Amino acid sequence: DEDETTALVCDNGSGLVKAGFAGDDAPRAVFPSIVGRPRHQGVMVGMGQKDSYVGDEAQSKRGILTLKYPIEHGIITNWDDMEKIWHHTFYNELRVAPEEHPTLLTEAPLNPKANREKMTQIMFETFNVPAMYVAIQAVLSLYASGRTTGIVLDSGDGVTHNVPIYEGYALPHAIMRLDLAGRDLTDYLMKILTERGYSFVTTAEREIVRDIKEKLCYVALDFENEMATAASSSSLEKSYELPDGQVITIGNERFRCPETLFQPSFIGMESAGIHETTYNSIMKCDIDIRKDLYANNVMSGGTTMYPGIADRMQKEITALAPSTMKIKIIAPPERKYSVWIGGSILASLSTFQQMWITKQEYDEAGPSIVHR
Amino acid sequence: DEDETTALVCDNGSGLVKAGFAGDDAPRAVFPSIVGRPRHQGVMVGMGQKDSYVGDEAQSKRGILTLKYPIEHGIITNWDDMEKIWHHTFYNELRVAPEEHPTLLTEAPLNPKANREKMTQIMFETFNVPAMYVAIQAVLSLYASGRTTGIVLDSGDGVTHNVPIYEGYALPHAIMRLDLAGRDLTDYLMKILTERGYSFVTTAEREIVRDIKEKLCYVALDFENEMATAASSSSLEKSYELPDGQVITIGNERFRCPETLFQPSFIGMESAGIHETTYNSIMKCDIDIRKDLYANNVMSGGTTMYPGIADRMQKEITALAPSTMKIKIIAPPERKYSVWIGGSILASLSTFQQMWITKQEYDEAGPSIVHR
């Protein structure tokens, strides 16, 4: 129990932090990855002067603060502001003292060696956690779907990745990163919806375009004769009621937004798209392992939640793969937390105890120890 | 029964080990003759750190290990790695304890005296077998075809040999060795098939060229007007479906690969070929024994299995031999295990008991005893 209860799992994202206790089924804490700094001197009624704001209080009060994102494209870019988000996570969100809890953290696919050593330096030397561990994100997603070999298409708020994993070892030279994700996708909907003849003028109009994207957006299979369908004008249309009455209608654009993930050309991107990239990762891997990867395309991440994403991907890679092959696109329902759940499982596991980096290992080996 | 059941027969090859119990009709165990050594530190899920891998686990996991072949051209070149393959054979493959089983082993044609003494030293002193015996391979092949005088063309994975045998004694000065066999032959097909406009790019493409060679390759008689036939383009062609759909076609090259065994010039070899070598062995033997050898060309080995090998050889040596002679090319169906079967017969035999080298002979005479 000492640490059975006690292991923490913190998944640091570009848009959201997911956090909680190893053992739980889902994150106890989910909140924006921002750190707000007040543009002016003054106070809220009853509070003192605050130097900084994090998560939702930074989002809610955004009009008087300069908002900053510590993690650009999955990599920690500002370490002063990240130690601020961690502090908030332990002390306010989970309300635990960190110096008696083992902490499993996550990093990104080709996270620079030096960063994995730096967050270890900050975990052990400024938070004084007993022990910690850094798992790679795609690797926890795979594992949370039971398996050990497969290829994960991972897509969240600032990055998309393909991480081919074989008997647990993520394959460095076959990993692909596509910098277009849910953030890019909300801003494109924004324009095709103002372009539908609308105005997201106040900040209460801006924010909810993102809630339109999440609730009403679709990834149609045969996106071709779906536009064609749009035109005959079926009961395909969908009206959403705004903060007030102002019933906005979205028929068609509803799927023009996730067609951006297959066609980056919709947004002036010259890069290849999700399905081709799944494939290219795969023809960059060893030959003998390619049947395995093809029958185990695990999807994880908030942006892979658009319904019919899996069917489109299913047919997208069947028709690029040699017919002798078995294609299989696994997309679980909890996928917006796969990464986290894979960490919860792993860290609550009976056999993981012997991989925890302890302060004994650290004080004796330097940050190098956990770096592997 | 004590040892009627109990005699083991282990045939050590350059590519495969064949093993089992004297008495059986075919080898209980057949597996690659490799010993893999992991290039990196780490584990498979649920297993411990393994220092070494042998047979199929070394082949399957080849991407993280450095593979090594203990037997180069039929001769044991690394004794640390061979004791590893034997260990695997007894304990894992046949799952027997060796210290209560007599073991019949095989060696190659002009196997150095010192080796036959060394594997005896390792059989008796590190495996503690009750008794053992080393038979010469061509000699077991002949005997498994009933006879005692004949000439064996023996061809496997790393060596080809001609071993003229007279009333059981293999004739040292007439034996010929040609270092081009099934291994060389798979790599030549490889090139004439990439040269047909193809790519065996991943390791799942590499391995199966060998399964193409085995299933679809032929030795045509009149290889001359078979190329000519290829050109008129008959229904001589043959398409194989790869691990996936990718239907590859092989019409012609199908026989250009075993024509390498008669023409070593196809592969930059200046040595003579199989049929000439059969013959030269024969005009190196005593005169009075040459009618015997000619009517008893026994074939054994995986690479002599190419259909129509016997007809080509039949006509190849008739037309080099004096017309007063009777030619006769025996090629049995089980020939990929002739050697082994000859050992199974011999070692289960009623009269062989008095040739077993026992630990009594050894502890008293030194390795010299079995060396003969």
Added chain:
Amino acid sequence: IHFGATGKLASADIETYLLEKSRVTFQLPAERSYHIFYQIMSNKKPELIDMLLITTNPYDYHYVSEGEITVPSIDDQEELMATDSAIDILGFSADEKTAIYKLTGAVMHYGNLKFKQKQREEQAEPDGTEVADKAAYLMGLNSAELLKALCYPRVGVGNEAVTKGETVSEVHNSVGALAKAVYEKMFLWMVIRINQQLDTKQPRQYFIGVLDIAGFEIFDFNSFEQLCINFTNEKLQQFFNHHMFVLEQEEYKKEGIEWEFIDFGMDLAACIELIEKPMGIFSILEEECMFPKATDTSFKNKLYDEHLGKSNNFQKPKPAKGKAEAHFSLVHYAGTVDYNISGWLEKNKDPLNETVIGLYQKSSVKTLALLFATYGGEAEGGGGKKGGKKKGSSFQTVSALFRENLNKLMANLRSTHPHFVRCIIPNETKTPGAMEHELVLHQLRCNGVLEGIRICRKGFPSRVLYADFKQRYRVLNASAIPEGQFMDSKKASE
């Protein structure tokens, strides 16, 4: 047993370890299941039979008549009351006392639950609502809802809840899993409830712990359960070896002899670390349990790659003798144990159909509802596919507790003055005044008796306890030895 300050009784405290869940569902040919079942069907309290909806013939309940049904030396009828009456004294509510019964019959019924293959489908479909009905009612459930959950287990892979279909073989097995699960829990509860009554307000100054557990037993077949027990014992042993080392060393200090020696426990630390330490057996065992697609085989390899050749107490089996297969041997103080790893992964996961548990969780039968609470409160933690059950308080290991409990125990054992008792079994044949040799010999090694003799003999073999010394030998210089023994229990012998 919590004694008071004066020295008079004040409280008690029970704790249970490793219950034979399998009896509930199985039984060897010469054996039988728990008594209760046979007690109840005895018919001393006929209402019970009708109340539970069963018969008096055990052959109607597969789960409980696979072995034997009657034992001559036992009067199921008498016990039933004993039992009954005990419940009461124990302060249980009639209702609870009703739950217990009703709940104990449901379990019988489950084993009667039958299923059949849906046509043209490989799915399981209920083969009748005869029994389900009873099981359902007895548990405060709904027949249907129950049979669905059972047949069409509605899971939650990803961030949702995916309805999964099961096979006939899968159901029969899941049922059995609940049957066992339920029984267990209940048993645990009863204990707690007991403990609850056994709780008084009066002050407590000290206690006397009485530990009853099994000893290191070696079988040609050693599975998971064996490891757990052996491990317990190898610990207990070290516990002694030390106490003795401590103890011994006092004498040589009291007397003034000059003898130096290392803790006798130390000899065993090797084995213990290998099991309980971080990269040790349990861990590798409990980690792999987190891998959604791991195999016993998988686990096995992980075990080796990491301990084989690198660890001395670790060894690859000797497959032949009286043993049944190969996986790994360990070198315990008592000897070498050949362990078979097959089922471990599972056994260790305690897989239970959560849909059903759901139903329990909202039963009309409070008690049943209760027993499940702790499962219902950790689900938060393992919301999506993959991951860690512990996040919400759910067990991650079959072994994760065992350890926790075994620690809480060995700790309680330390703040204690250990007093040892070794029970022996003369002859398998049940004959007074007789003894098979090798049979007693065995016990002696695994007992600790032979190890205590060893440690004794290192040296100065025979060691006499002072009073035991007085009495027997006073007579030798009768006047001066008696005076010594009487005048100072120790100083006397001196």
